[PDB]
């Protein structure tokens, strides 16, 4: 089959460069053009440029001119994309996308799986685990919401459980935000009965393996 295999996720400092690979199999490598298209977390698809693997000639998008370099290796059937002088706005999933040369019209038939590139000034850092003290969700329904703020960590991922995996009902763990500081932050919340507050203990178990940070944080009810 036609298959496009991309290189693994990468973490980069601002000003640095990244080189993403796209290994093609299952078709005659030099017979089809290869494009690169990115998608930033809070944006649409963005075209970066095109390479013709027969001869190696390139045409780049205006906004990436002087910043992007596309190459190919015919012997390994691999297309490369290099993006230099990285900035936080370059945080995106990068796709290679194949294009049939017949017609002239640029459109895509087969894509790679995508490569996440994260551009951040941050180095490896464990999260601080702050309690989110139980607060009334519904006074008629008799529910309270409590949680943990898993703040200022790098890189992804982090694991959150409650009461060492014993509590799953009404648990919601949010996707992380990448803050302006270049550090991640997420929350995990539990909807509990109000009547369980002060009898039942609630502990969020936070594990961030890159920073060897394992924290078990008890979330106590509000009291003067």
């Amino acid at each position: 089959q036609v298959q496009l295999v991309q290189s693994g996720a990468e973490v980069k400092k601002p000003g640095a460069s990244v080189k993403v690979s796209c290994k093609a199999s299952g078709y005659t490598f030099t017979s089809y053009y290869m494009h690169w298209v990115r998608q930033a977390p809070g944006q649409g698809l963005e075209w970066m440029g095109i390479i013709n693997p027969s001869g190696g000639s390139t045409s780049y998008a205006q906004k990436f001119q002087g910043r992007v370099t596309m190459t190919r290796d015919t012997s390994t059937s691999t297309v490369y994309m290099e993006l230099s002088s990285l900035r936080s706005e370059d945080t995106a999933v990068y796709y290679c996308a194949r294009d049939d040369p017949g017609g002239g019209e640029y459109y895509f038939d087969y894509w790679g799986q995508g490569t996440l590139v994260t551009v951040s000034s941050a180095s490896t850092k464990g999260p601080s685990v702050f309690p989110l003290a139980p607060s009334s969700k519904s006074t008629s329904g008799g529910t309270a919401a409590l949680g943990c703020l898993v703040k200022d960590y790098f890189p992804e991922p982090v694991t959150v459980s409650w009461n060492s995996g014993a509590l799953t009902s009404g648990v919601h763990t949010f996707p992380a935000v990448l803050q302006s500081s270049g550090l991640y932050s997420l929350s995990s919340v539990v909807t509990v009965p109000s009547s369980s507050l002060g009898t039942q203990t609630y502990i969020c178990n936070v594990n961030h393996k890159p920073s060897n940070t394992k924290v078990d944080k008890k979330v106590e009810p509000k009291s003067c």
Binding site: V37, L132, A133, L149, V171, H172, S187
Partner: protein
Amino acid sequence: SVLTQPPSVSGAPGQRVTISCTGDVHWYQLLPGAAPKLLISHNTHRPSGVPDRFSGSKSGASASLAITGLQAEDEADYYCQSHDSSLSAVVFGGGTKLTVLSQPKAAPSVTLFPPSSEELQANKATLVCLISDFYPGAVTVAWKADSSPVKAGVETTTPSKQSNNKYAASSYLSLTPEQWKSHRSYSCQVTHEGSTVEKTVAPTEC
């Protein structure tokens, strides 16, 4: 040079929906955990393998993707695409999120958490606005310092599906310990399907 499509379109199961792209137009469907797939090429061509409920048309500068007998599984991002020959460049529309309204309206419950004692020890303060049990999965969040809008230090997550199939969202306001003590109160304002739910928190008094 520029393709314009609405950010949001919705419809109920079994109904017909249209997505407009205004500037040959090609349409891509983006489902999570999968590559973009071509549904329509050259305005009207449906490739082999694409279900017959998808169709494309074009009148003048306006291209349209239509889905008849809408299914819940058609919920996805839809992108229109062109080849701008004057600049020799691929142009994409901004994307249209298609929502399939498969359950009734449910208003969000909003819970606003003050900064923890522990965070304040570290000379920081974060306010956490938890938004839960809403449908459909779209909200607007606005933060307030007393009455005035807060324009910085805000991070908000795209709505995620809960285990009960309703949606949840979170928003964070970063501030200094002094700001938390300066103002009388801070507010989280959530807008869902025209309706506004607001919550306020103040420093604990004992």
